[model samples]
Target: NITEEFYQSTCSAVSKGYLSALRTGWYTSVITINRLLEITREFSVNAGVTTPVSTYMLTNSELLSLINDMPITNDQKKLMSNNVQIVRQQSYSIMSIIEVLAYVVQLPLYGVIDTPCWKLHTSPLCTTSNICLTRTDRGWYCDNAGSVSFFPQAETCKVQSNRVFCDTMNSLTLPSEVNLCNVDIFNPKYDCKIMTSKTDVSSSVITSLGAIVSCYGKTKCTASNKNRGIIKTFSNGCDYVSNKGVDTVSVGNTLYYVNKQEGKSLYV
Candidate 1:
């Protein structure tokens, strides 16, 4: 009984992909053969999942004939090819934007002293036009217009501090804290400045950290305390951290975490 159950489960799992194609009106014995061939090639190249049986293993020539008979116009083929290229280009562009933003945000926290015991997460770049970052008890917050209520803000500062902690040779000589002392008191109000060296006095740290404070203060000159602009423009740049439960595209296995509309498009 157990063996039969296992066999059924395995067949169900194996057939699911083909079933999807069938439901979508893309099924054919030839297509099935092609799919199996693709799967086999994928396995051989990556050593990931097991290879499916090849089309050559099938005894039915009619299956191959049906695959050859499948009607695929040249225009449809071209459109599909273009769509794939567009997706690849967009994905790469988005990833590059994120990488650069990460670098800029972490620049200030470099050469810091100690390790932060806290976890840090980055959010996907918002598809919305206006971007805003906010401070929270947990870490930071970000929002792109019309998406969700908010995004858990990413911490480029933490990443920089982590780099220093791992690379620094004289642990004792390093400052007790890193960028925790450099708090952005303005909108997206977060505290994250630390003394860099053991010999550095708090006053010096405060004064040095004042540069960013002054920058934020200058940027927030006339904005209302409650206005999002105060945080959006406080720093020359902003980091978006994903909300803990919100779905985002930048991270893996995060399909369910994205908003419903976006998730549908992604899955579809």
Candidate 2:
């Protein structure tokens, strides 16, 4: 059986890209199932996998059940079902591509527990319980609404009155108000870095992360010299300014670690 480790590892860049595209499509309205079909074909071919893509396709019932298992409303389910039907009818051969995409995405969160890590809810275990996106004065968060819990399984997510808040260091956004089906419960890797000293690499990292220079500012942190550090500034999308010659990047409020070497990166 396919495992979460395999899906998230380096060799699974194709799966990662597909998952990212699929996740983006759900919230951004720009990706359609038809286009998703095209992406699966295009990406798999580019990866040079020898197996015919069809060998990994999911069945019609499997696709429909996947949509049905989501914590979305009946209206949302109806919308999704209609889309799947549209695809199934359009080209019988093209229908197979979706199965692989669905399988890759579902395996981590819903598949057999291959690792001793946590995941969002689904299936027989989620019969009475599900995750709900809640809005708080602080930000968006995930909470358990029924007998099921996000605990033990979702140990990394901090609990606040049963709310499972995604540790900002690992995820790009706060979990809230979306179907958990498209959401990733965990991100084993950090996307950006905060450097204490500015360098060509630090500047380039900020640029690569889609943020530009904002300004220079004093950080709330202290530098090695017991003075307020100065940092180059950017935005919440990983911009930076500094303290004590410290180049700080802000995404969330938490301070995960301090990387001493300029080559190394720190997290929120």
Candidate 3:
């Protein structure tokens, strides 16, 4: 809705970013939160509104309050102590930035996802600093280079053995299912605001869709048994070997990352 104006606002945001970067002397490359900061400032300038935080969604009224505070005027104290707002427009621009830019300022880094199920995946999103990842039926993936991580979440069991999941919740409450993608990773509220979301796209129930995107995407370093343990007192009855450098494989109980370090597999 109103994306036209939203985009228009972004244009100004771009100008803000370009100028701000040079002004602050952050002279850096392309893909950067610095760039996003520019985009953010522009979005604010473009739209006379604000959006939600990584942990929760602000009601239109809430957004108004946050945005309208304007330095908490003495009039504000007489009126009602109000907080400042960062008016974010358009679902994609604001939310997408919310999804990628984690909470607790200096905000974040993120990507797009689906059910690829391995650390090796690809996305139109990734960059050197910003690593974009996706989820799959198998596990998680990077969504770039089209590579798969060594460890994959076994769908059959679906237990919390090895997998990084996103939770879409409010107030920083951890969802029951960790494998599910419905939480906010960037938000550090409620003790780091560890949370998730429902679908790959957006959650409907909450106008805010309070969400958390699992950051793993996929495991780069894998678990292994190759020249690992011969009589290595292991658990989960894995009692096996891969010497293959496994990523998110489970030894049975907790998440296990078996990669040979000094002499054998180092459990994660």
Candidate 4:
């Protein structure tokens, strides 16, 4: 419980300042995949680059510098500089925003997952290649073959469930025209382009994360719930849900365990 609370506090603090940046520069310009990765790392120090130890290590100065150094517009920096406390209260919200941002852009970045399981669980690495399947209760999520990237596999499980089981693979496939990351969230061939491409973080892009973040806490908004299902229901039961508005969101797509609530509602 302490760890969970600490993580929530840490995440909320980082998010507050980010929202201002989002309101200013992030909303208007394209963000490169590496930029997104950098932001994730700054927000969550444990992300990629190395194995994480259990602790909230982002210091107050780190928080301040992180905002000031952001590629956001000067106007955005002004807003955050005027109010650092806002960063603390809204840090958790950024986790959702980053998740949506990653999805909207169709690129990958890690460190949004703040759960104790994420911090404590040691992700397995594929010794043979540049990719590895993250085996979790939800499904296998893909990421770098080892601990060199941000959080091992930062993508949320429900959004993009990997079809390949981890145990069956001896090595990850290198990114090539045919296999390209050996997975596809938006496109197997195209999404990987962002791995090197420098894209702007525009309004349309950040809006997706904003829309999804707005769905939190409430449980009666179909505007988002229907289209936001985890994955398509399949025979493998990876995405199966027995009851609408019960175990799963409406439309029969399985809800991420964290998002599931015990009631009837349109909210995701």
Model 4 TM-score is 0.20
Better of 2 and 4 by lDDT: 2
Q: For candidate 1, what is the lDDT? A: 0.22
Please tell me which predicted candidate would have the highest lDDT against the true structure: 2
Predicted candidate 3 versus true structure: per-residue lDDT over 1-268, tens digit per residue: 0010001110110001000000001111112235456546645664522333322333345444433443433542222222222112112123233325422211111122232332211111122324332322222222222432222432211112222222111112222233222232233342221223332221001001111112122322123344463323322111122223332333223344333235555776
lDDT of 2 at 2: 14
Off by over 4 Å in 3: 1-104, 119-145, 149-268
- TM per candidate comes to 0.17, 0.20, 0.15, 0.20
Q: For this target, which candidate reaches the highest TM-score against the unseen true structure? A: 4
Point out where model 2 deviates above 4 Å: 1-57, 69-72, 75-195, 198-202, 206-268
Weakest ten-residue segment in model 4 by summed lDDT:
11-20
Candidate 1, run of 10 with poorest lDDT: 13-22
Residue 28 error, candidate 2, Å:
27
Better of 1 and 4 by TM-score: 4
For residue 182, model 4's alpha carbon misses the true position, in angstroms, by: 5.6
lDDT of 2: 0.28
Native-to-model Cα distance after best TM-score fit, residue 194 in candidate 3, in Å: 36
| Model 2, span 237-264: residue lDDT tens | 1122222244333322323122333476
